[PDB]
Amino acid sequence: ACQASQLAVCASAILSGAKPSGECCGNLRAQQGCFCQYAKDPTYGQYIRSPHARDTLTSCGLAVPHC
């Protein structure tokens, strides 16, 4: 139901770009709902369309948006 918090911890990488993290790719899983549809969300388009974002999720290889 869109937590908007389980991913915040990752935002550090998406926005700033400190360093990825495994927990990140895991947090989204707990969602597997809004996270998927979020792919359409324009306001957060900068988050999903990030450079390190796709890398983090891909590194895990669990679920990719655009579903």
Ligand X SMILES: CCCCCCCCCCCCCCCC(=O)OC[C@H](O)COP(=O)([O-])OC[C@@H](O)CO
Residue numbers at the binding site for ligand X (CB under 6 A): 4, 7-8, 11, 28, 35, 38, 44, 47-49, 53-54, 57-58, 64-65
- Residue 47 contacts by C-beta under 8 Å, 6 or more apart in sequence? 7, 11, 14, 15, 53
**Least spacing, CB of residue 30 vs ligand X, in Å:** 12
**Least spacing, CB of residue 1 vs ligand X, in Å:** 13
Q: Within 13 A of 30's CA, how many CA atoms are on the CB side?
A: 11
User: Which one, 4 or 30, has the nearer CB to ligand X?
Assistant: 4
**Least spacing, CB of residue 51 vs ligand X, in Å:** 9
10 Å CB burial of residue 52 (0-12, 13-18, 19+) is middle
